[PDB]
Design a binder for these strands. Structure first.
Lengths: 80, 100, 125, 110, 95, 152, 204
RNA sequence: ACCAGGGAACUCUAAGGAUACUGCCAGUGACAAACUGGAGGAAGGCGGGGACGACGUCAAGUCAUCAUGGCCCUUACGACCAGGGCUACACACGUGCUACAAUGGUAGGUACAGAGGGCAGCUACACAGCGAUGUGAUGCGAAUCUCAAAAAGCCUAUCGUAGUCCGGAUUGGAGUCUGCAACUCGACUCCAUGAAGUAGGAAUCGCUAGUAAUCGCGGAUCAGAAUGCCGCGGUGAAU
């Protein structure tokens, strides 16, 4: 997955958006295109909107979600 | 191949050439056992902040004449097809048909 | 101090023939220790028994290269080579056996389009 | 002999019998028997009861089979109720590990 | 005790070059084959399909090494004057 | 192959007994090129039978048993007038030996004993005393010819 | 379906056009430079009748050998044309390069020259049959042992492309020591592209 | 490189020649071409393998290597970039790989190669680690140093016909690396889990000798990504 020495991978622009949202505890979704960013304990509780390929789907970061990448909660293929 | 793709490959290799040395020094900095943890982490952040194409991984070497992605040979720098034509014409030194 | 060279399908071996006790040393070690296969031991001793001279002459053997069962044949061919160089008369009888014939069979090329030298991809209707 | 709530056949070596116990493997059994006097060669029938008791204590240090089964079920249920793509995969009985499933997709459904 | 290593693609050419180099030192009175790399290259004759139709080309590089017992003053300089370009590479250890 | 007959390859006789037939038998038992395994299995089986029968010469016992096993007459199919019928013909000398060796190997494959050497030893004993699947197979081959015996 | 004669003949009875030695890494760039030089020289000298070119690059300066039926114009008046071509060839490449020209005793014998003539004939709309016959006859008069000419395409503007070949003399392709000369050229006729193949056999 | 006794004899490496030509003996033969056997030789009749694919046949495959006739689109059928997709399976299908075990599995020891690759780099050795690998350190642009240890095999212990000490699919957990990034979607590492499968329906395929079967080892594309493909040598059949 990722070498522990390199630490988590967290993209700079989502990082900036999430800290600027944490100082306010705002509830409006953070619409984001990067589904490769690590979910950290800091962003537990608020809501992002992760691109699934076609549109953005909301993802309310729960407690049992740190340790997963953002794109895991945004399915890309829609099969019935 | 398309002229657009050929020029894309040229301009993509351009940043690799421009940042070849910075990447070397920065990689040494991050791999330095002696370097401080925060120093190495900041260097890693800078590396990830470097432009997209600067990495030599997005480079895909291609035939000089036709720009063919595939059937490429590192020794000759040519695709399989143009390599065959030049070899059979004899323009490729040392290269001949193989039967052993 | 007669000397000869015999090869078997990869290996080269060099054989030295002189009068003596007849003890055989292979690659600086005993022959029986060196070879773990009874068949290969038998290939090594095949020529001497034919004309009943197992211990007549001392043998010094060094055999690099190839494999376990090819080195035995190379040693046999080298022993025959030294024996024929020693004596003209033996050559006819040893020829009747054919041990003096170098093996011409070697692992052949894998032809492209074929899995092996001749194995071809099967097709099923 | 009885270890961790189930029976192990007595006709073969201690390590091989430990292999049968769920949640126990051959390497783990070797590790267990190395610490204590019991040797892997000795059979369970030959081995004395006090030795078996020390073995049970060593096994008890390791996570037991019921606990392991329950944790695996809990993790799968956590993925399902989280609803992640992995939970969707578990519920829909499709490979969640990323293994290529174009043609040989047989070994997920049963 | 200068040492000269010659590398050429052409087996016929390399021998002539070595013979000339030996001949000059013999004339001036001074007293004077490693494995060759073999590589194979696979090229599809058919552009689109038919992978079983192929041309295989092999290039051989030949290296020759020479040792000189005594580098006399007259002998050493003739080596620099002699030249044979276009497909022959000369390397001098000079050690 | 509608082509000239060529001399067969010269076989290498076995070391322990110095006999052509023994190595020829070891060849069939050999599988996937495991001549070392075949040698060991054959030697073990022969030693077991020799010890059981208290016979000094296992090679001679094997020759007698193989000679008994080999079938004299084998049926061969022939086509005449767009019809197929069995025809009894005398078997070729080498083919008799090859057939016996193959049949013994096949029956030794299905013998009960856990190890191959014991299966093979049991089959040799049964063949020597005229019992078992190999003897039944030879009897069947003879029986097919005997049934009609109306051609050639 | 037929192997290039020159490729098979390189092994024993022919000399490679390019004869230079380079290390693995150097080889990739050296070959590309050589190919670029050949293409540019062919485009520049297309108007002139030129045979195959033999190029040898040593370290630094490169050396080029060109054989052409018409030496005079390529040399120019007192080397003026060759000097200009040399300055441009120096600009494209690295260290100053030197080029020399060798006269050809007979243009008909060389395979490339006849194919260039046939290509020009097809461009100028001379009948393909006439072109092949006159081209073949000139070689027999010159003394070439064998000449064979094959034309593929929409000859005469026909809707259906058809292949016409003419032989006069022994032209053993399978004899590797036949030192047969083969060159391929393309004629840009308005209706469609026409492929011209020329085989010349001078002997052993 | 090789040491037979510091030498150059032998092996090997790599540039040349020498031999093989039904040459010779005997036969059958239209007094012939040929064929049958025999001597010698390393090799006998084409000694084995490869390369070489004739006029043409299938309007056979390629406008997506490239080239060109015609035809079409030109704020778009042209140009760039992020994300995803080419990796989705109720099921069919052709190529292979690994098995179903005792001719074996697992543990210990112990031998015998070939060819190939290495600055867009392979690492001797020390220590951390169960491990992949990590930090140092050193040789080598290599007949020097190195990947590298060859595996089948041989000696002993054991498993004893059992869905097993067979089999390793699948999933949970932890991790190391390449890469800016491993979620869709990397290959490896350890721990646990241990599915089918106990030999296969009609039918069907390859193979004549160092060949079939079997064993591992290389290279190419490659930043990382083989069971594929291209080569290699060990063992070595029956007919």
């Amino acid at each position: 997955p990722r070498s522990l020495k390199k630490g988590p991978f967290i993209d700079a622009h989502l990082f900036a958006k999430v800290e600027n949202a944490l100082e306010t505890n705002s509830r409006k979704p953070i619409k984001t295109w990067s589904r490769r960013s690590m979910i950290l304990p800091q962003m537990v509780g608020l809501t992002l909107s992760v691109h699934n390929g076609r549109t953005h789907v909301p993802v309310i970061v729960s407690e049992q979600m740190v340790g997963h990448k953002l794109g895991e909660f945004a399915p890309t293929r829609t099969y019935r | 191949a398309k002229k657009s793709m050929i020029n894309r490959e040229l301009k993509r290799e351009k940043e690799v050439a421009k940042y070849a040395d910075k990447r070397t020094k920065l990689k040494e900095t991050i791999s330095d056992m002696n370097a401080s943890d925060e120093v190495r982490m900041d260097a890693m952040l800078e590396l990830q902040a470097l432009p997209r194409n600067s990495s030599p991984v997005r480079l895909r070497n291609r035939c000089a004449i036709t720009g063919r992605p595939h059937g490429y040979f590192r020794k000759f720098g040519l695709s399989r097809n143009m390599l065959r034509e030049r070899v059979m014409q004899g323009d490729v030194p040392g290269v001949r048909k193989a039967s052993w | 101090r007669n000397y000869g060279t015999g090869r078997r399908k990869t290996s080269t071996a060099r054989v030295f023939l002189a009068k003596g006790t007849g003890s055989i040393v292979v690659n600086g070690k005993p022959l029986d220790e060196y070879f773990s296969r009874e068949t290969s031991r038998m290939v090594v001793r095949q020529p001497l028994e034919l004309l009943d001279s197992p211990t007549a002459y001392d043998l010094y053997i060094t055999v690099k290269g190839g494999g376990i069962s090819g080195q035995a044949g190379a040693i046999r061919h080298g022993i025959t080579r030294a024996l024929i160089e020693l004596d003209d008369t033996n050559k006819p009888a040893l020829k009747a056996a054919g041990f003096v014939t170098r093996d011409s069979r070697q692992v052949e090329r894998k032809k492209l389009g074929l899995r092996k030298a001749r194995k071809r991809p099967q097709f099923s209707k | 002999a009885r270890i961790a709530g189930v029976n192990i056949p007595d006709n073969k070596h201690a390590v091989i019998s430990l292999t049968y116990i769920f949640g126990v493997g051959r390497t783990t059994a070797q590790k267990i028997l190395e610490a204590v006097g019991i040797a892997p060669t000795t059979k369970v029938s030959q081995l004395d009861d006090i030795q078996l008791d020390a073995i049970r204590a060593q096994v008890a240090n390791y996570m037991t089979e019921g606990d392991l089964r329950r944790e695996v079920s809990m993790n799968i249920k956590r993925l399902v109720d989280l609803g992640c793509y992995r939970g969707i995969r578990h519920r829909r009985n499709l490979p969640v590990r990323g293994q290529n499933t174009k043609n040989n997709a047989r070994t997920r459904k049963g | 005790r200068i040492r000269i290593r010659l590398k050429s693609f052409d087996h016929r050419l390399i021998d002539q070059s070595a013979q000339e180099i030996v001949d000059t030192a013999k004339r001036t009175g001074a007293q004077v084959p490693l494995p060759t790399r073999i590589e194979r290259f696979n090229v599809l004759t058919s552009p689109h399909v038919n992978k079983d139709a192929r041309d295989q080309y092999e290039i051989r590089t030949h290296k020759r090494m020479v040792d000189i017992v005594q580098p006399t003053d007259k002998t050493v300089d003739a080596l620099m004057k002699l030249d044979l370009a276009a497909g022959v590479d000369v390397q001098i250890a000079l050690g | 192959p509608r082509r000239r007959v060529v001399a067969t390859r010269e076989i290498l006789p076995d070391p322990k007994f110095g006999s052509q037939t023994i190595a020829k038998f070891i060849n069939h038992v050999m599988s996937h090129g495991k001549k070392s395994t075949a040698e060991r299995i054959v030697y073990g089986a022969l030693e077991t039978v020799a010890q059981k029968r208290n016979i000094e010469d296992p090679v001679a016992f094997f020759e007698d048993v193989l000679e008994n096993v080999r079938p004299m007459v084998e049926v061969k199919a022939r086509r005449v007038g767009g019809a197929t019928y069995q025809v009894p013909m005398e078997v070729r000398p080498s083919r008799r030996t090859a057939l016996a060796m193959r049949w013994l190997a096949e029956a030794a494959a299905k013998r009960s004993e856990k190890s191959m050497a014991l299966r093979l030893a049991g089959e040799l004993s049964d063949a020597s005393e005229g019992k078992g699947n190999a003897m039944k197979k030879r009897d069947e081959v003879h029986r097919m010819a005997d049934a009609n015996k109306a051609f050639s | 379906q037929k192997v290039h004669p020159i490729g098979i003949r390189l092994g024993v009875v022919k000399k490679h056009n390019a004869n230079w030695y380079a290390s693995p890494k150097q080889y990739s760039e050296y070959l590309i430079n050589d190919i670029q030089v050949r293409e540019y020289l062919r485009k520049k000298l297309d108007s002139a009748m030129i045979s195959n070119i033999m190029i040898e690059r040593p370290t630094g300066a490169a050396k080029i050998t060109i054989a052409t039926a018409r030496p005079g114009i390529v040399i120019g008046k007192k080397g003026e044309d060759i000097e200009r071509l040399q300055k441009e060839l120096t600009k494209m490449m690295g260290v100053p390069a030197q080029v020399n020209i060798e006269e050809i005793t007979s243009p008909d014998l060389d395979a490339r020259l006849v194919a260039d003539g046939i290509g020009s004939q097809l461009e100028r709309r001379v009948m393909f049959r006439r072109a092949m016959k006159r081209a073949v006859q000139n070689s027999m008069r010159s003394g070439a042992k064998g000449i064979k000419v094959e034309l593929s395409g929409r000859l005469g503007g026909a809707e259906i492309a058809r292949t016409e070949w003419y032989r006069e003399g022994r032209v053993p392709l399978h004899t590797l020591r036949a030192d047969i000369d083969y060159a391929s050229v393309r004629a840009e006729t308005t209706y469609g592209t026409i492929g011209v193949k020329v085989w010349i056999f001078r002997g052993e």
